[PDB]
């Protein structure tokens, strides 16, 4: 078998870790491999393997996100834990355990727990406060499934999770079979400002869904990156609302979530999500990056919440990348890029179980159910788009294509790969620490 390396352990609270790295980093340069003839770090005259190994050649930093259980992995933690407790499982797959779902930030706990009671007992709920933490909570084992958009499907794909079911959007009499191509990312501006143009974006306020998402961050800033040629985007735009980014940035201080919840990537902010990016577009922004279906879902009294009750379709028009205007009604001839639909991810061992339980659990609570108030409708929600995308129709089956490489397609994997040196998400760094 293969095992992870030996490590220098230290405390979790007092540390101090920067003096260990500061010490050893100046140690392996001067003393590593015949770098000094007088003293050897990795050899000794009166013994072998003292304080270090004699096979070691260098020291790199353990990233700060990675704790103990993510260092050892999940297969090795499970093997050592079963070897201590002494279980030796037989495991024929006849009945499956209840799936521990994961949900974030106390609205998804409400809808999740109501779904936990309206089921037989087959879906449970475990919380989180960011999506980046709930992915780690899947990797440990304290949760099983999640519904993620494709940017976080790339991150959880790097970390070792697999997609199982993929959300559809097109209504059909057979949508469990049909593989949809995806949905189009657009940017939405108003009739009040006609001077705006994709070629003219210097010093303008830009609303975003959240950091790491497809249509809000990866697709537009991956296209803006090849023009502006440098990684910092807080200096290109004047202001803008993007949650989840660093608290220092202007991108943090345009948003509204008060107090201390500013730039917190969850439903604590009003501006989080597609519709909240539309809120900062209507209130204080110049351009927002959303899906193409955002303006029809918030146009014309579809939202009873009053700011979207008063609004209209025709004033808001989306902009192409060459510099022209094309209407929101005609989204196909003007789009930033085609991003894939969202997907449900889980570990590789509970793939068959989450497949089976969500397929059966879908037909009871899907889009066939009318009279949602006074019953349960799993796919509808209170316009905040929580636990599931609100305009889902059915959870599509993934056959022959269950891998982030195969599911996400080549253009999107390249399109994220052109932005991978600019990424600042710590969990992606900790997951890509594994690779030699």
């Amino acid at each position: 078998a293969q095992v992870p390396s030996h490590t220098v352990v230290a405390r979790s609270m007092g540390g101090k870790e920067d003096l260990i790295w500061e010490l050893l980093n100046q140690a392996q340069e001067h003393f590593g491999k015949d770098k000094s003839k007088e003293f050897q770090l990795f050899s000794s005259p009166h013994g072998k393997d003292l304080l270090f190994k004699d096979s070691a050649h260098g020291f790199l930093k353990v990233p700060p996100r990675m704790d103990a259980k993510m260092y050892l992995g999940y297969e090795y933690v499970t093997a050592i834990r079963n070897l201590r407790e002494g279980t030796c499982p037989e495991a024929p797959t006849d009945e499956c355990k209840p799936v521990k779902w994961c949900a974030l930030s106390h609205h998804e706990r409400l809808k999740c727990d109501e779904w936990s009671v309206n089921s037989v007992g087959k879906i449970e709920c475990v919380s989180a406060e960011t999506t980046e933490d709930c992915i780690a909570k899947i990797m440990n084992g304290e949760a099983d499934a999640m519904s993620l958009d494709g940017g976080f499907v790339y991150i959880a794909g790097k970390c070792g999770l697999v997609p199982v079911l993929a959300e559809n959007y097109n209504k059909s009499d057979n949508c469990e079979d049909t593989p949809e191509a995806g949905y189009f990312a657009v940017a939405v501006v108003k009739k009040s400002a006609s001077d705006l143009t994709w070629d003219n974006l210097k010093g303008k306020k830009s609303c975003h869904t959240a950091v790491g998402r497809t249509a809000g961050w990866n697709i537009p800033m991956g296209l803006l990156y090849n023009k502006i040629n440098h990684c910092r985007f807080d200096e290109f735009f004047s202001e803008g609302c993007a949650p989840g980014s660093k608290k220092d940035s202007s991108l943090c201080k345009l948003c509204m979530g008060s107090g201390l919840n500013l730039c917190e990537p969850n439903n604590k902010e009003g501006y989080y999500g597609y519709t909240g990016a539309f809120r900062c577009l209507v209130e204080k922004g110049d351009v927002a990056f959303v899906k193409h279906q955002t303006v029809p879902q918030n146009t014309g009294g579809k939202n009873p919440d009053p700011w979207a009750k008063n609004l209209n379709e025709k004033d808001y028009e989306l902009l192409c990348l060459d510099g022209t205007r094309k209407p929101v009604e005609e989204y196909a001839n003007c789009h930033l890029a085609r991003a894939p639909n969202h997907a449900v991810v889980t570990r590789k061992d509970k793939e068959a179980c989450v497949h089976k339980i969500l397929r059966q659990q879908q037909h009871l609570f899907g889009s066939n159910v009318t009279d949602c108030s006074g019953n349960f409708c799993l796919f509808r929600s209170e316009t905040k788009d929580l636990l599931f995308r609100d305009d889902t129709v059915c959870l599509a089956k993934l056959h022959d294509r269950n891998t982030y490489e195969k599911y996400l397609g080549e253009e999107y994997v390249k399109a994220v790969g052109n932005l991978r040196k600019c990424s600042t998400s710590s969990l992606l760094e900790a997951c890509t620490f594994r690779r030699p």
């Binding site: 706990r109 727990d113 109501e114 449970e124 006074g374």
Partner: protein, 641 residues
Amino acid sequence: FRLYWDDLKRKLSEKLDSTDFTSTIKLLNENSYVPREAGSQKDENLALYVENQFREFKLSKVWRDQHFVKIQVKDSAQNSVIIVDKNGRLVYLVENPGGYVAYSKAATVTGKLVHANFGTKKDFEDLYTPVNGSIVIVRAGKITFAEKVANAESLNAIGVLIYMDQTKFPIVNAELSFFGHAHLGTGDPYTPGFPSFNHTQFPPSRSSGLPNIPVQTISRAAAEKLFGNMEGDCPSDWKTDSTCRMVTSESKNVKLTVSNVLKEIKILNIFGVIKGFVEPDHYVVVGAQRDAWGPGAAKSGVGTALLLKLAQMFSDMVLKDGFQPSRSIIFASWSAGDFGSVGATEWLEGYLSSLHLKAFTYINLDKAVLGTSNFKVSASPLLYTLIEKTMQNVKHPVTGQFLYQDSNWASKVEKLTLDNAAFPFLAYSGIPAVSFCFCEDTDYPYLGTTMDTYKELIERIPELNKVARAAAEVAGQFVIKLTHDVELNLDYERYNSQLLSFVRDLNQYRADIKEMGLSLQWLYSARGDFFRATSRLTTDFGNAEKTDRFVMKKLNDRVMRVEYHFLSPYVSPKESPFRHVFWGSGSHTLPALLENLKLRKQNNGAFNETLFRNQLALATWTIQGAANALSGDVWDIDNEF
């Protein structure tokens, strides 16, 4: 050479292969111990014998306890039943009953008679004739006597007669008379909620559960002579004799006279302990009932015999063999276990302060052996996983296969009935409890009669020794599984299915809860918080060292009060004592909320809306309160936002 679970299980089986229970059941049925009323002299000699044996097995501390209790015995005048006309001049004597109901009021009344099948609360609506202004008869079985007298008293009757038919209780002798207590509740009634010690000066107080009507037991031929004059026919749903009839003839009448006087008697409890080596102050209690109205071979001899033999095996196995239990073990012999088990209830209400968070399990060795066909357990749900593993390690005494045959048994389990001695512990004190019987399909026929003797019990159960050996093995498995290891085997995740069953039962009446104007969703979220509580606690048992003791004590103190936090803190213990929101009596528990909502669909005008909304607020905050008390501390909640 330490001892682990395998060596200790085969060591226990090597102990059980040797002992002979049958001589000790024949010894607790000798002519010098055989009629054991509560407080009588024949109880005392057995009590000194049990204390003497507990000194003889070298237990680490043997101690006793005596206090004074009011029971109700037969007066010199004979209570009786008789048939009269409207004037009283027609006199035809039925009989003079030997048996009597304790705590029945002393009065003489006349009236016409109405039948009921058992006195279930469902029966008096399904009955044709109105019940009030008239004496009832009921048929003995399926509920306690106190619920029959409480129901028929609740519908304005006057007297209750009780008989045993031939279909439910097949006995050859048509003369046999019997016994039962009529207090709804447990304990000495004239001190409700406080102990009967003579420190408490014996103040005038009277329990709120005692009846107001004369109750009496008659034999079978005494019932058929009343069935000769009564005219009617039973429904065919009641599986019964051919000779039952509903109501009296119109010119006829039934007068019964009941004369019973109070007596003040002395009660003993006899105890012994085995000390623990890691934590001595935490202990597990094992009990038994010492007295019973007849000879008492099935009701008290088998329980006390199993208790004495478990004292022999565990004290022998600690002294000679080399076992080291980490927690103490208390052996107990309760007396007056038959008047609602007043020994145990006055013992808790005496020493409730010293038992707060210390005791954490009772095991009830009473009525363990009744037949040889099934195995019927009844327990608080923290023991269920434990019983799982124990049912995989005990062979049935007749067929060589294990007792865990049905893989789905947690839903078949019924809750603890009020006459069982573990019910004051679980319902009143918040301590996990368990009882278990080898019950036949039909119940043991002559249980509280004068016919209960040894040779009838060896003729009914042909191999008493192997069956008593199996019940002693199950109790030994429990005691070792709780007190050998650093981890308590109280499985706390089993409450999650109970909360899910409650909310899933209320989720059908969501349509009317939305009509009142209040949402249900806070109670959904309360169930959710209890799930994340037990999940986080299972994680903390994951990430701890097992060798270290200071952290496992901090976790086991957090598991050991998962039962105390279900006792409702908004009701008086002296008024309504059984404060357990799941499993107890009152207007505060969860079946009373399901009932009090279920009345509204009738649109009768009987439901009480203010009492409902109040009940929903208290039950919701009790479940959410236990969920906050499991997960960590004050600052790790995970509150509103």
